[PDB]
Amino acid sequence: FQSNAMAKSEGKVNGATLMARALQQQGVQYMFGIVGFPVIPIAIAAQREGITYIGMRNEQSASYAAQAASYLTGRPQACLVVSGPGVVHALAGLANAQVNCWPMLLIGGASAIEQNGMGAFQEERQVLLASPLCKYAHQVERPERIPYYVEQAVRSALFGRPGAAYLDMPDDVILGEVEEAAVRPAATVGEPPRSLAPQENIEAALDALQSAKRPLVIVGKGMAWSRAENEVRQFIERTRLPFLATPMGKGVMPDDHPLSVGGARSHALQEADLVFLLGARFNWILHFGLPPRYSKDVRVIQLDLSAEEIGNNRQAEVALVGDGKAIVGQLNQALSSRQWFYPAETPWREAIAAKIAGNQAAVAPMIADNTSPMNYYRVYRDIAARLPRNAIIVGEGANTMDIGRTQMPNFEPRSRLDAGSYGTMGIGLGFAVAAAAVHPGRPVIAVQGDSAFGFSGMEFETAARYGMPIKVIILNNGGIGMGSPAPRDGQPGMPHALSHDARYERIAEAFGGAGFYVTDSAELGPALDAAMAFKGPAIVNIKIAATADRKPQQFNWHG
Amino acid sequence: SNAMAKSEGKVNGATLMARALQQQGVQYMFGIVGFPVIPIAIAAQREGITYIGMRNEQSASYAAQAASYLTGRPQACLVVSGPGVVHALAGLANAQVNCWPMLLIGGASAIEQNGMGAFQEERQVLLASPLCKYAHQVERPERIPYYVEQAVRSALFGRPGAAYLDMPDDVILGEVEEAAVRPAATVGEPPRSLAPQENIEAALDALQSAKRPLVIVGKGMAWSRAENEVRQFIERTRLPFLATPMGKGVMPDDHPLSVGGARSHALQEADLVFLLGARFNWILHFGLPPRYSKDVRVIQLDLSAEEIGNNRQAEVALVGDGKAIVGQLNQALSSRQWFYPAETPWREAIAAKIAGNQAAVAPMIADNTSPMNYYRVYRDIAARLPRNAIIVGEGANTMDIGRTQMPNFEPRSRLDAGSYGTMGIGLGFAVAAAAVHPGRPVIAVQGDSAFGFSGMEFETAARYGMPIKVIILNNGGIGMGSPAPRDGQPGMPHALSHDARYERIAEAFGGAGFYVTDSAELGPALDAAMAFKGPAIVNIKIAATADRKPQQFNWHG
Amino acid sequence: SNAMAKSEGKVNGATLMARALQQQGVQYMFGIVGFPVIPIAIAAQREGITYIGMRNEQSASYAAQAASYLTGRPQACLVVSGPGVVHALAGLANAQVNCWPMLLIGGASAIEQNGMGAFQEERQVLLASPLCKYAHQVERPERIPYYVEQAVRSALFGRPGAAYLDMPDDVILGEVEEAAVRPAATVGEPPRSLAPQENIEAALDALQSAKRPLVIVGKGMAWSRAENEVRQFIERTRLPFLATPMGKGVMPDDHPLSVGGARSHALQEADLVFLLGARFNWILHFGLPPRYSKDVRVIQLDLSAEEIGNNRQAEVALVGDGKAIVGQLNQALSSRQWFYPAETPWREAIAAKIAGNQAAVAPMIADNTSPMNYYRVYRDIAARLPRNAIIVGEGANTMDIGRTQMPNFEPRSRLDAGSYGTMGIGLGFAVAAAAVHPGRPVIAVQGDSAFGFSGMEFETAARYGMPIKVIILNNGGIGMGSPAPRDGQPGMPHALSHDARYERIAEAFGGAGFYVTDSAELGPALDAAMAFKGPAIVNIKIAATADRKPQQFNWHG
Ligand SMILES: CC(C)(COP(=O)(O)OP(=O)(O)OC[C@H]1O[C@@H](n2cnc3c(N)ncnc32)[C@H](O)[C@@H]1OP(=O)(O)O)[C@@H](O)C(=O)NCCC(=O)NCCSC=O
Ligand SMILES: CC(C)(COP(=O)(O)OP(=O)(O)OC[C@H]1O[C@@H](n2cnc3c(N)ncnc32)[C@H](O)[C@@H]1OP(=O)(O)O)[C@@H](O)C(=O)NCCC(=O)NCCSC=O
Ligand SMILES: CC(C)(COP(=O)(O)OP(=O)(O)OC[C@H]1O[C@@H](n2cnc3c(N)ncnc32)[C@H](O)[C@@H]1OP(=O)(O)O)[C@@H](O)C(=O)NCCC(=O)NCCSC=O
Ligand SMILES: Nc1ncnc2c1ncn2[C@@H]1O[C@H](COP(=O)(O)OP(=O)(O)O)[C@@H](O)[C@H]1O
Ligand SMILES: Nc1ncnc2c1ncn2[C@@H]1O[C@H](COP(=O)(O)OP(=O)(O)O)[C@@H](O)[C@H]1O
Ligand SMILES: Nc1ncnc2c1ncn2[C@@H]1O[C@H](COP(=O)(O)OP(=O)(O)O)[C@@H](O)[C@H]1O
Ligand SMILES: Cc1ncc(C[n+]2csc(CCOP(=O)(O)OP(=O)(O)O)c2C)c(N)n1
Ligand SMILES: Cc1ncc(C[n+]2csc(CCOP(=O)(O)OP(=O)(O)O)c2C)c(N)n1
Ligand SMILES: Cc1ncc(C[n+]2csc(CCOP(=O)(O)OP(=O)(O)O)c2C)c(N)n1
Ligand SMILES: [Cl-]
Ligand SMILES: [Mg+2]
Ligand SMILES: [Mg+2]
Ligand SMILES: [Mg+2]
């Protein structure tokens, strides 16, 4: 049938189409998840409006992909999960997005309202389970209110401190029909509001910088979310202050900028008398701004959108509450009427240069060491020389990610996605799929350890199914953080042990991708060149030394 | 060196944790190590506990509750702080829905760093509480034996459920004097309770008055270890019975009194239904029309008093343990002279519907054409299933059709999506079954979608020498295949890869992989996989449009 | 007019809610009306339900659970949206801690206005859930009979607890055809369940071997309506027993086998303790040292299997209903021929310690000097309590000393702060008792601090003609008086008004007020208050430093 010559009603619309039109109206371009009861019509309706749907292999990776796409696009992107266990699997993405202050829209199906209390198929208190992990969580009780709830959730997830929003969609709401003309419209959510700091706070910030003898600027991913790279790069060029990038703050300032103190991080944090926080929290990543990693009398200028975050752990001398791009614009404006810049010759620049040269001399022999099995720094020598300038880099593991953080530079903002503020394993291939869906014209390279790849390695089939040429590089030392000798007979396997002889790259051959196995330093170069030139996804399985480690440091990263 | 003097009067929280777990009968611990639970896993191995490192906490949390169901005592799940606990919330929810015991042990950031934004600091007890029978943080190391005892008892006693113990870093590493730690009692078997005698007699009176009676055997009886009692009751009453999905095995599926081949007719026409440890939830279609008679009479045997009369009123309430109460029914039946007659119109209608459904699927079971349908595939699978095997089913058509084509003869020998209808339990359940029962064959039959939820755990099986048999029925999508995405249009949301070579994942970890497209290959491939001394994967490219047999009603409705 | 044609086919949610509550035995409804629950209370009265409007939702939620405990079925508390439900969270938490049934019915803003910031919009199911056995929102009017039946069943069956139903405005006012409303079954009596016979015999084995046995009668037996079987068990075993605070009355407090006068000695020296519906929580001092023997043996009779062996291991577990299991023990006592011997050293030590404690308080009971101590005041109070009275006790010294000086001879005749130690239950419990048992005297004895929590509810009693007798023991502070502040110093945080004339609050609402400062006034004032046909307040000013009898251990420790 379906003949156009035949009369049709064509005056009604159902909840799935309203959800699709509302999502597209609010800038949702990507939807990751796994279909089934009752959200099959939602994914189909999303495709009719132009929303790109991506079927994953686990809702855990799907929820991670939604927030990564949100951080990259700047607007909340969707995750579609089924009722019951589909939502519980997605709680991983809600908690992770909450800790990173990233937006996210989780759309979870539910059993029909008329069956509540009966023990229906996958009936669950889904709003209650998700509420403590979301900025916004509500159930859409009737289809004609879908435009209201979608605009509500997107605005709550995008405005202020970004967080996750959850919308519960019962099956009878998805399938319920309403008159096309009887549905109330909803306004389109615009750019998140930016606010400014008082003028006396701006001048007090510039005064404190001039009074500092060993100043240090710390650039966090809050500035990347603000798209403040232009303002920050103008601020560092105008002030000539040394800066330190956070893990995912890399790229906002080019990693090869001569004012970076990355190769002297411990000394810079320890000896600085004044610290300028740019969208960065004094949490575990920055060692709480307290001893034994900071001077007891460290002075703090804190720029954060959340007023409650000011003075946490270490008191802030100058508070700058508001948007990063807007406030740094003020600082650049107020600097134009001043002749102060950090002088070109100070003992502080002298000490930073020495510590950078000292740390480079410590890792230099390991970078050149060609003996097999290879160490971490030897592996990254061949990786780094082949990472394009506009690449998007996903990092996951312990030594693989942390050493890769210092060996893989980023010259553009929002081009690094790692374990983040939650220290999460399982974001690897989910972040890569999101990066490959948002920037299909840019290279996507995921560098994971053997343990990290096992959390989401099945998502490699997702990439090959949607033609995503993701370059997965596995650093297999045979365990979690460290290799282990093979157990004697009767001796159980070590709890951290994995499979050092595993051929993870054959998973790529299972889904039409390219697989490469490396055990010798002479194989590494040609194996990476082949995986880069391969028109499709690839896996390079590098068997590294079991005892390999990072260069020694005065303090432990966790302490 | 033993010559050097050493102080030995102190013990930390990880070792007290291991000793308490071993004392309470915890034999298996699944999880992934890392800060701060590494000492817990190491100390557990020192006390003889079997630790099994998984590839995702999601599968680890599913394996723990499966081992708890098989062993009959709460088993452990060890996860790191923060996202390790959040990833394991899947198992807590699934254990809660199935009324299975489970003990989740989650690490936590140091207490003295709370509020500072510590690494993986999280309100873990608050998140897990709505999914647990019991949830509490261990504040001091000297109270570990107390909390482990109370947690295991709360998971095991009464209606079983999940328990959670939060272990901060400072508690794990904190030392205490060994002679000062307060001992804890050992949690015994879950207490059993009986029904009043007039309830037992009223239940037998209702059975004798029924013209079309039906006993429904649920997995509560499998949990209660009541197979001997149920078998005696069915044998002496001659009552027809229907087995729930995981209730299969309590009665052997080849028993002549089974109505499984006429399930829809039995539920719709029965004038009396005897629920043995089974809920009137979605699996039994709520005991209501259009699947049941409006006047259906219910005898309900359940351990939870609040469950009696849900959806459909219960004429006779039997609240208590399934083994003890069926034992009462066997004893009260001795003092009578009744069994359901050997020739009734009810028995003839059941036999006629059974034969009718047999003739409906007979051409599909014999059809050798390629690509094969589901029933043709299971003809070779069922012919090679040992009678003592443990069967893991996962998917939609693969699991549902596998439920009718793969019979069970021992209780607690099928593990499927369960009452939650969960995808992601496949290889986690198989790893659990392979650990608890190393001398028995473990066969997991999954769809191509269900295998992707936990397919990484094949490395866990190969690393621990578990000869798991994974048979993948690949139709190229979720529930149904799909033609190629054409005309520049996107792929269908349910579509996966029909040409995927999942068996190559087995060769990634030293296992054996077999690829089957033709019906002539299925036999030799299954023979080789079963004889291979190690884990194996059989990937079968079935027809994209293959479906189950037509029914009067949809399974969900 | 009746001559006019009217359409009687439709019915709204408020009327359906009323008929469902009446069908499920809800006779009493306490609360405060307003948006949107006004049609609910009016509909309840139209079905014969007694509605009682309180002055605070705190006392309403408390009066509901007390009326439930007194009737044996869940009674209703009706509150408005937002702050009405939050004010009622007090009763939910208290009902959960005491294992008492309760049905809280909370109004809610219209569903079509959710997310808009509607009047008193609140996540009311989410806030109430961690305090209820059952919490759910009624989404459509046609499902009201279903939700009311399931809520009453959840609150009544198993271990009792609180139930919450969320009633949105559009559900209350929404209409549906009567003929299409799905009917609901009537929730019957809570199911009882027996203990296995080998546990019954093992329990009697332990009792025969014990040299110093002690039975403890908890209020779980009073809820089970087991007074007949407990009185038969004690009489035939001739065992010493100890009543818990609200377990008083199950056995008559004047029974010669009571060890109430030697409570501390009986607990510390007993080699076997028989818990009858009593927990080893703070009330029974955890069954642990320094209040019990290290190696004390425990027979524990509880309905909750998870409660067995808490703090102190249970040697013999008796999981099931109190009345039913004690009935088994009485049957098994016939096959035996054992009683605890008439002359044992254990009986001589109990009698000597009872006589010692009476000689320690005898001078205080006899001291006629004014201002009076606690025991002198209770001398005239106890002599004027009818044997069929209902005693409400609240405060610290007032309640604790009143527990030992006001005997109960019938069960479920005493209501006090309970397992939560709540201040604010006084006048709410009294209104509940006066509503449920109008033919019995209701005497409430409160401290000055406890009366301030709910004293405004005296207007409710006068408004409904409840002759509640309120006796205030005013020492001018919380647990202890205070010298008036001097030298410009601030008032003590525990101090109140020692010269307050609380009895004038009774005169504000037509009741009778009496003020007492000397022992010569106490008698005549109590007589005139008991005879006054109406509610009354007797305000007694006691010595600021009056205290309880000294003990070896503090009640809390
Ligand atoms: C918390 C941290 C920000 C702390 O940072 P650090 O590791 O201490 O500093 P890094 O920037 O990583 O650099 C490490 C050291 O290398 C030096 N360094 C940096 N760059 C260079 C270059 N280019 N050349 C030579 N040396 C270099 C730098 O000065 C440091 O030495 P020094 O100056 O001498 O210190 C980070 O470790 C982190 O985010 N880790 C992730 C934790 C996580 O999520 N793990 C996964 C879950 S773990 C499951 O248990
Ligand atoms: C809810 C159910 C218990 C309903 O059971 P049914 O499928 O209706 O009955 P089944 O026992 O499975 O058998 C199906 C039909 O085959 C008949 N049958 C049974 N055994 C046989 C044999 N041996 N031979 C021939 N025919 C048989 C039986 O009488 C039924 O026909 P009729 O008598 O004619 O009916 C079950 O479908 C179920 O639990 N499904 C799991 C749902 C799930 O979790 N899916 C994954 C998530 S789905 C994501 O959206
Ligand atoms: C926790 C308790 C069960 C502990 O019981 P005890 O007070 O120790 O025992 P009681 O039965 O009350 O009796 C106390 C003592 O009086 C003795 N006693 C009892 N009857 C008599 C008679 N008739 N004559 C003489 N002496 C007697 C009894 O043997 C005890 O002495 P000895 O045997 O010599 O010890 C109880 O105190 C309680 O429930 N308190 C409630 C606390 C509360 O909720 N407060 C409100 C919130 S508090 C705000 O901070
Ligand atoms: N638009 C914005 N402008 C300024 N600050 C922001 C903005 N958005 C988020 N932030 C802040 O950035 C902070 C994120 O810091 P964090 O993620 O800990 O940085 P890092 O982990 O890179 O050190 C949050 O406290 C958040 O309040
Ligand atoms: N020892 C026991 N005795 C009796 N019933 C039990 C026991 N343990 C659990 N149960 C009950 O068994 C029921 C399980 O039902 P369900 O999982 O729905 O069965 P199925 O899914 O096999 O139909 C639960 O309601 C639970 O209360
Ligand atoms: N019908 C019943 N039969 C037996 N025990 C019951 C019954 N109903 C409730 N209980 C149990 O009685 C116990 C109440 O003890 P508790 O409130 O501590 O009494 P007390 O305060 O007098 O010591 C609870 O553990 C509850 O599970
Ligand atoms: C969700 C989650 N699970 C587990 C961990 C614990 N742990 C921290 S890093 C890591 C993997 C480290 O090993 P690997 O990925 O192989 O990198 P390597 O250090 O060996 O190079 C894990 C599993 C975690 N942080 N998060
Ligand atoms: C955690 C979870 N996610 C999603 C679903 C939805 N859905 C129901 S069955 C199923 C898989 C069905 O496909 P498959 O495993 O290939 O079996 P098939 O029917 O195709 O043979 C899924 C994903 C679910 N039930 N649980
Ligand atoms: C809801 C609540 N509020 C406060 C308390 C604290 N406190 C315990 S008893 C009590 C009052 C005791 O004093 P009173 O009622 O005057 O009797 P008294 O001991 O003075 O004779 C209070 C307020 C409590 N237990 N519960
Ligand atoms: Cl090179
Ligand atoms: Mg590794
Ligand atoms: Mg499929
Ligand atoms: Mg007082």
C-alpha distances out from residue C156 to B444, C144, C163, C192, C224, Å: 43, 18, 9, 12, 11
Which residue in this structure is represented by tokens 């969320």?
A: C166
d(CA C369, CA C376): 9
CA–centroid distance, A68 to ligand 11, in Å, is 24
Residue C36 preceded by cis peptide, ω within 30: yes
d(CA A480, CA B296): 58
Atom of ligand 4 nearest to the CA of A249: 22
HSE-up of residue B505 (Cα within 13 Å, Cβ side): 26
| Closest in C114, C129, C150 to A117, CB measured | C150
User: Which residue stretches of C496-552 are H helix?
Assistant: 504-507, 519-531
d(CA A402, CA C66): 62
Give the other-Cβ count within 10 Å of A257's Cβ.
15
Q: Are C148 and C24 in contact (CB under 8 A)?
A: yes
C-alpha distances out from residue B57 to B62, B119, B121, B228, B413, Å: 8, 19, 18, 36, 24
C-alpha distances out from residue A164 to A90, B110, B126, Å: 11, 27, 18
CA–centroid distance, A405 to ligand 1, in Å, is 7
Rg of the Cα atoms in chain A: 25
d(CA B544, CA B479): 9
φ, ψ for residue A249, nearest 5 deg: -80, -10
DSSP A132: G
DSSP A260: B
Q: Please work out whether the CB of residue B281 comes within 6 Å of at least one atom of ligand 5.
A: yes
Q: Are C523 and C376 in contact (CB under 8 A)?
A: no
Using DSSP's 3-state secondary structure scheme, residue C185 falls into coil
Q: Are C165 and C37 in contact (CB under 8 A)?
A: no
Which residue in this structure is represented by tokens 């103190």?
A: A261
Q: Are C497 and C485 in contact (CB under 8 A)?
A: no
Give the other-Cβ count within 10 Å of A362's Cβ.
12
In our burial notation (b when 16+ CB lie closer than 10 A, e otherwise), range C366-392 reads eeeebbbbbbbbbbbbeebbeeebbbb
d(CA C49, CA C63): 15
Q: Are B369 and B380 in contact (CB under 8 A)?
A: no
d(CA A306, CA A312): 11
φ, ψ for residue B42, nearest 5 deg: -65, -45
d(CA A541, CA A524): 10
Q: Are C21 and C149 in contact (CB under 8 A)?
A: no
Nearest by Cα to A474 from A432, A505, A512: A505
Inter-chain residue contact B153 with C306, CB threshold 8 Å: yes
Q: Are B81 and B167 in contact (CB under 8 A)?
A: no
d(CA A465, CA A460): 9
Q: Are A170 and B165 in contact (CB under 8 A)?
A: no
Alpha-carbon torsion (A56, A61, A66, A71), positive or negative: negative
d(CA A137, CA C125): 14
Nearest by Cα to C431 from C412, C449, C458, C413: C458
CA–centroid distance, B473 to ligand 12, in Å, is 7
Q: What torsion, rounded to 10 degrees, do the Cα atoms B508, B511, B516, B519 define?
A: 180
How many Å separate Cα A523 from the centre of its chain? 31
For residue B238, the one-letter residue type is R
Alpha-carbon torsion (C208, C209, C211, C214), positive or negative: negative
Atom of ligand 7 nearest to the CA of A475: 21
φ, ψ for residue A553, nearest 5 deg: -135, 160
φ, ψ for residue A505, nearest 5 deg: -65, -15
Inter-chain residue contact C187 with B157, CB threshold 8 Å: no
Ligand 1: residues with CB < 6 A are: A 247, 262-267, 285, 359-360, 363, 398, 402, 405-406, 419, 423, 553-554, 557; B 34-35
Q: Are A89 and A60 in contact (CB under 8 A)?
A: yes
Q: Residues 2-61, chain A: which have Cβ within 8 Å of B?
A: 34-37, 40, 43-44, 47, 52-53, 55, 57-58, 60
d(CA A246, CA C456): 61
d(CA C444, CA C451): 10
Q: Tell me whether strands B28-31 and B50-53 are parallel, antiparallel or unpaired.
A: parallel
How far separated are the first and last CA of chain C, in Å rounded? 70
In this complex, which chains have at least 3 CB pairs below 8 Å with chain A? B, C
Nearest by Cα to A506 from B502, B32, B426: B502
Per 3-state DSSP, chain A is made up of helix, strand and coil in percentages (nearest 5) of 40, 15, 40
Q: What torsion, rounded to 10 degrees, do the Cα atoms C458, C464, C466, C467 define?
A: 80
Residue A148 forms contact with C (CB below 8 Å): yes
d(CA A349, CA A346): 5
Token code pair at residue B537: 């994967």
Burial of A93 from C-beta contacts in 10 A (0-12 / 13-18 / 19+): buried
Q: Which residues of B touch C101 (CB under 8 A)?
A: none
User: Which residue stretches of B214-344 are H helix?
Assistant: 219-223, 227-237, 263-269, 322-334
Ligand 6: residues with CB < 6 A are: C 98-99, 159, 218-220, 223-224, 244, 246-247, 277-279, 281, 283-284, 302-304, 307, 321-322, 419
Nearest by Cα to C35 from C89, C92, C82: C82
User: Which residue stretches of A229-343 are H helix?
Assistant: 229-239, 265-271, 324-335
Residue B252 preceded by cis peptide, ω within 30: no
d(CA C246, CA C416): 7
Nearest by Cα to B54 from B504, B337, B354, B456: B456
Token code pair at residue A56: 């994953």
d(CA C227, CA B497): 70
* Neighbouring residues of C344: CB distance < 8 A, sequence distance ≥ 6: C211
Nearest by Cα to C85 from C165, C174, C172: C165
φ, ψ for residue A504, nearest 5 deg: -55, -30
Q: Could you write out the three-class secondary structure of B132-153?
A: CCEEEECCCHHHHHHHHHHHHH
DSSP B391: E
Q: Are C403 and C37 in contact (CB under 8 A)?
A: no
Using DSSP's 3-state secondary structure scheme, residue A349 falls into helix
Ligand 1 binding pocket mutation candidate from A406, A407, A549 (most atoms within 8 A of CB): A406
Inter-chain residue contact C139 with A148, CB threshold 8 Å: no
Q: Are B306 and C158 in contact (CB under 8 A)?
A: yes
Nearest by Cα to A167 from A31, A51, A72: A31
Q: Tell me whether strands A471-476 and A514-518 are parallel, antiparallel or unpaired.
A: unpaired
d(CA A166, CA A150): 10
Residue B240 preceded by cis peptide, ω within 30: no
Experimental method: X-ray
Q: Of the ligands numbered here, which is closest to the C-alpha atom of C398?
A: 9
Burial of A525 from C-beta contacts in 10 A (0-12 / 13-18 / 19+): middle
Token code pair at residue A485: 């000798």
DSSP B41: H
Q: What torsion, rounded to 10 degrees, do the Cα atoms A7, A9, A14, A16 define?
A: 20
Q: Are C318 and C299 in contact (CB under 8 A)?
A: yes
HSE-up of residue A385 (Cα within 13 Å, Cβ side): 11
Q: What torsion, rounded to 10 degrees, do the Cα atoms A130, A133, A138, A140 define?
A: -60
* Neighbouring residues of B327: CB distance < 8 A, sequence distance ≥ 6: B229
d(CA A422, CA A417): 13
Nearest by Cα to A515 from A549, A474, A468: A474
Inter-chain residue contact C192 with B196, CB threshold 8 Å: yes
For residue C481, the one-letter residue type is G
HSE-up of residue B4 (Cα within 13 Å, Cβ side): 4
Token code pair at residue B402: 């596998």
Token code pair at residue B53: 């490192």
For residue B356, the one-letter residue type is G
Q: At what angle do helices A376-384 and A399-407 cross, to 10 degrees?
A: 50
In this complex, which chains have at least 3 CB pairs below 8 Å with chain C? A, B
Q: Are C274 and C218 in contact (CB under 8 A)?
A: no
Please, which residues bridge with residue A300 across strands? A275
d(CA B421, CA B416): 8
Token code pair at residue B213: 């009676």
Q: At what angle do helices C38-46 and C13-23 cross, to 10 degrees?
A: 50
Which residue in this structure is represented by tokens 């202020």?
A: A160
Q: Could you write out the three-class secondary structure of A222-244?
A: HHHHCCCHHHHHHHHHHHCCCEE
DSSP B526: H
Q: Of the ligands numbered here, which is closest to the C-alpha atom of C226?
A: 6
Resolution in A: 2.4
C-alpha distances out from residue A539 to A405, A471, B453, Å: 20, 6, 20
Using DSSP's 3-state secondary structure scheme, residue B293 falls into coil
Q: Are A184 and A144 in contact (CB under 8 A)?
A: yes
Nearest by Cα to B207 from B332, B348, B349, B338: B338
Nearest by Cα to B250 from B226, B281, B282: B226
Token code pair at residue A107: 């759309």
Token code pair at residue A356: 């950078």
d(CA C370, CA C285): 36
Q: Are B12 and B141 in contact (CB under 8 A)?
A: yes
Which residue in this structure is represented by tokens 């009493």?
A: C28
Ligand 2 binding pocket mutation candidate from B219, B361, B400, B478 (most atoms within 8 A of CB): B400
C-alpha distances out from residue C333 to A147, A252, B173, C274, C328, Å: 72, 84, 53, 16, 9
Q: Quick one: which H or E segment has residue C136?
A: strand C134-137
Length of chain A measured in residues: 559
HSE-up of residue B9 (Cα within 13 Å, Cβ side): 4
Residue C304 forms contact with B (CB below 8 Å): yes
Nearest by Cα to B40 from B183, B136, B148, B179: B148
DSSP C258: B
Closest Cα of chain C to B112: distance in Å?
A: 28
* Neighbouring residues of B205: CB distance < 8 A, sequence distance ≥ 6: none
Q: In what order do the strands lie in the sheet with C50-53?
A: C50-53, C28-31, C76-79, C102-108, C162-168, C134-137
Residue C213 preceded by cis peptide, ω within 30: no
Q: Are A94 and A163 in contact (CB under 8 A)?
A: no
Alpha-carbon torsion (B459, B464, B467, B468), positive or negative: negative
Nearest by Cα to C269 from C554, C552, C556: C552
Rg of the Cα atoms in chain B: 25
Inter-chain residue contact C317 with B190, CB threshold 8 Å: no
Burial of C48 from C-beta contacts in 10 A (0-12 / 13-18 / 19+): exposed
Using DSSP's 3-state secondary structure scheme, residue A445 falls into strand
Q: Are A367 and A381 in contact (CB under 8 A)?
A: yes
For residue A240, the one-letter residue type is R
Ligand 2: residues with CB < 6 A are: A 36-37; B 245, 260-265, 283, 357-358, 361, 396, 400, 403-404, 417, 421, 549, 551, 555
d(CA A287, CA A291): 8
Q: At what angle do helices C374-382 and C397-405 cross, to 10 degrees?
A: 50
d(CA A85, CA A39): 13
Token code pair at residue A43: 């994914």
Q: Which residues of A touch B310 (CB under 8 A)?
A: 118-119
d(CA A408, CA A388): 11
HSE-up of residue C515 (Cα within 13 Å, Cβ side): 9
DSSP codes joined into one string, A264-291: GHHHHHHH-SEEEEES--SSGGGGGG-T
